[PDB]
Amino acid sequence: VDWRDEPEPSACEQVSWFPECTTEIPDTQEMSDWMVVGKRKMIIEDETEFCGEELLHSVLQCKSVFDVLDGEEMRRARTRANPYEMIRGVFFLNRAAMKMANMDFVFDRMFTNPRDSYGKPLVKDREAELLYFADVCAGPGGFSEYVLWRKKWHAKGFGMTLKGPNDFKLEDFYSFEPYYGEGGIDGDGDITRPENISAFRNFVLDNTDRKGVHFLMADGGFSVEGQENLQEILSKQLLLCQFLMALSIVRTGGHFICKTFDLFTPFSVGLVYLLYCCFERVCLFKPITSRPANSERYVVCKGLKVGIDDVRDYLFAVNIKLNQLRNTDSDVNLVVPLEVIKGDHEFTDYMIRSNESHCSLQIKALAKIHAFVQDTTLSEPRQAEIRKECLRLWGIPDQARV
Ligand SMILES: C[S@@+](CC[C@H](N)C(=O)[O-])C[C@H]1O[C@@H](n2cnc3c(N)ncnc32)[C@H](O)[C@@H]1O
Ligand code: NA
């Protein structure tokens, strides 16, 4: 694998969108046969419905190269190999915060300055109007810190995240109501329990005139140490519930941004297909603040449509089933038929092209880290200058925490 003739790194990033959906939103009747249960499949190597075999097998093999290497040694090389590494978190509580700073710029401030379908801003700060947002799978809270810092005032947020070591750290915010699923501070904050979903949903609706938030951010993940290649499969329920939460609390015309990992499986692509039916426009995007060797990307959904209740209730039901099937030999493996997805040739084309381009880049980034492990003299000379250019472009002042 040759990573060495890759283009120069740059603060300039390109976005590609799914074409606008041209079909009706599916109703309950249409979806009645869509949920397929089968044996639990802890196998990723044959998942080629939306990606060529050679690319899939290559990315798996480039990850597995690291099975024998000490973690810190790999990370030290990663630090040197990533052109965008030095951005870090700037003055925010973590580097995750700068992923939202990055993407709020790239998507034309659609999150901090949301507009109606005709382009007119919805929130008038001069009139003291409130921007309402939500943040789930979200502790310690960088994404929210960013939103609150950009707005300075007149931004009301609602959050839900697991208790414990990765809970919100509101005290660490540079410049907001966490909710755990039972009222006040009570509950475990688990987005996969149906009662927590419903409770958070009512909490947010009751506090937004029953309309919902201008937008929802979701950034779910957890440790997959020792089973890294299975990440997508291991995080399938979390992906579903975040998508479900978007259809549950985002107001009409509102937006949704959510972290995913690999999107090779029919389960994952079928979920993305549902978002694409439910929103005016959808994109898959990996910001340069997301490290280049990993499977992370973001699905960005603009302009939620009217009439999405049947899809919402469908996903609510699929989640209940996923919970029923935990620790059994079965699982939900499809949520939209493959023949339906691939029947949409425009969708499928974008999907394959997205998966393959991400794989191509990730393969190079992984091979590069391996090279940097073996030769500690290799370097990315323009890290500081690239950092400076990104902050300037994104409107992020170069200042530190006191
Ligand atoms: C990568 S972090 C989020 C970082 C956040 N965007 C920020 O900027 O600080 C993932 C978060 O999702 C949480 N999470 C994982 N599983 C969850 C679940 N089932 N319910 C609610 N939160 C969950 C984790 O505990 C963690 O806080
Ligand atoms: Na990252």
3-state secondary structure the chain: CCCCCCCCCCCCCCCCECCCCCCCCCCCCCCCCCCEEEECCCCCCCCCCCCCHHHHHHHHHHHHHHHHCCHHHHHHHHHHHCCCHHHCCCCCCCCHHHHHHHHHHHCCCCCCCCECCCCCECCCHHHCCCEEEEEECCCCCHHHHHHHHHHCCCEEEEEECCCCCCCCCHHHCCCCEECCCCCCCCCCCCCCCHHHHHHHHHHHHHCCCCCCEEEEEECCCCCCCCCHHHHHHHCHHHHHHHHHHHHHHEEEEEEEEEEECCCCCHHHHHHHHHHHHHEEEEEEECCCCCCCCCCCEEEEEEEECCCCHHHHHHHHHHHHHHHHHCCCCEEEEECCCHHHHHCCHHHHHHHHHHHHHHHHHHHHHHHHHHHHHHCCCCCCCCHHHHHHHHHHHHCCCCCCCC
C-alpha torsion angle, residues 366, 368, 373, 374 (rounded to 10): 130
Angstrom distance (rounded) from CA 361 to CA 363: 5
C-alpha torsion angle, residues 237, 239, 242, 243 (rounded to 10): -110
Domains and CATH numbers, the chain: 1-402 (3.40.50.12760)
Angstrom distance (rounded) from CA 176 to CA 12: 33
Length of the chain: 402
Residue of 278, 282, 286 lying closest to 300 (CA atoms): 282
Angstrom distance (rounded) from CA 341 to CA 339: 6
Angstrom distance (rounded) from CA 74 to CA 293: 11
Give the count of alpha carbons within 13 A of 171, CB side only.
Answer: 1
Q: At 54, which amino acid appears?
A: E
Residue of 260, 269, 216, 282 lying closest to 18 (CA atoms): 282
Instruction: Copy the structure tokens of residue 280.
Output: 């005016």
Farthest CA pair distance, the chain: 62
Instruction: Copy the structure tokens of residue 74.
Output: 């790999």
Resolution (A): 1.9
Angstrom distance (rounded) from CA 159 to CA 216: 10
Angstrom distance (rounded) from CA 210 to CA 60: 46
The last residues before gaps in the chain (C-N over 2.5 Å) are 175
Angle between helices 53-64 and 345-374 (to 10 degrees): 30
Q: Is 14 marked as binding a ligand?
A: no
Residue 330's DSSP bridge partners are: 39
Neighbours of 394 (CB within 10 A): 18
Angle CA(208)–CA(127)–CA(177) in degrees, nearest 5? 35
Angstrom distance (rounded) from CA 124 to CA 130: 8
Residue of 329, 305, 293, 288 lying closest to 250 (CA atoms): 305
Angstrom distance (rounded) from CA 313 to CA 102: 33
Instruction: Give the contacts of 315 (CB within 8 A, at least 6 positions apart).
Output: 240, 243, 244, 247, 274, 335
Q: Which ligand is nearest to the CA of 187?
A: 1
Q: Which ligand is nearest to the CA of 235?
A: 1
Neighbours of 324 (CB within 10 A): 11
Instruction: Copy the structure tokens of residue 285.
Output: 């995007």
Q: Is 337 marked as binding a ligand?
A: no
Residue 331's DSSP bridge partners are: 38
Angstrom distance (rounded) from CA 91 to CA 173: 10
Phi and psi angles of residue 15, each rounded to the nearest 5 degrees, phi first: -115, 135
- What is the distance in angstroms between the CA of the first residue and the CA of the last residue of the chain? 44
Q: Is residue 142 within 6 Å of ligand 1 at its C-beta?
A: yes
Angstrom distance (rounded) from CA 18 to CA 284: 8
Which residue among 100, 160, 162 is best mutated to probe the pocket of ligand 1, counting the most ligand atoms within 8 A of its Cβ?
Answer: 162
Residue of 241, 239, 316, 263 lying closest to 31 (CA atoms): 316
Residue 217's DSSP bridge partners are: 135, 257
Phi-psi region of 9 (alpha: psi -120 to 50; beta: other; left: phi over 0): beta
Instruction: Give the contacts of 165 (CB within 8 A, at least 6 positions apart).
Output: none
Q: Is residue 137 within 6 Å of ligand 1 at its C-beta?
A: yes
Angstrom distance (rounded) from CA 171 to CA 173: 6
Residue of 190, 185, 155, 199 lying closest to 173 (CA atoms): 155
Closest-lying ligand 1 atom to the alpha carbon of residue 238: 19
Which residue among 133, 146, 150, 161 is best mutated to probe the pocket of ligand 1, counting the most ligand atoms within 8 A of its Cβ?
Answer: 161
Q: Is residue 178 within 6 Å of ligand 1 at its C-beta?
A: no
Question: Which pairs from 87-91 meet CB under 8 Å and 24+ separation?
Answer: 87/289, 87/387, 87/390, 87/391, 89/142, 90/391, 90/396, 90/398, 90/399, 90/400, 91/174, 91/397, 91/399, 91/400, 91/401
Q: At 205, which amino acid appears?
A: L
Q: Is 63 marked as binding a ligand?
A: yes
Residue of 226, 224, 208, 227 lying closest to 216 (CA atoms): 208
Residue of 159, 119, 121 lying closest to 140 (CA atoms): 159
Q: Is 139 marked as binding a ligand?
A: yes
* CA 140 to ligand 2 centroid distance, Å: 15
